[PDB]
């Protein structure tokens, strides 16, 4: 199991678990391209006031 790391010449390699095997490296000039959670993503998760776990699972 490897955790997210930034490779200087390649990009931001995501987490990979070789027990279920995926070295996907997303590179770009915007935070959205990198594949990480940005501030806007935290505003979309904060406005989802209707999401609720099923009663059986609660």
């Amino acid at each position: 199991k490897q955790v997210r790391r930034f490779i200087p010449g390649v990009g931001v390699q995501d987490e990979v678990d070789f027990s279920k095997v995926g070295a996907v490296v997303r590179d770009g000039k915007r935070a959205g391209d990198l594949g990480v959670r940005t501030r806007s993503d935290w505003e979309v998760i904060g406005k989802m006031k209707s999401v609720l776990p099923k009663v059986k699972a609660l």
Binding site: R4, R5, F6, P8, V12, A31, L34, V36, R37
Partner: peptide
């Protein structure tokens, strides 16, 4: 050049 991505790799 290097901090923006390094800061995104360690949330």
């Amino acid at each position: 050049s290097l901090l923006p991505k390094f800061a995104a790799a360690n949330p």
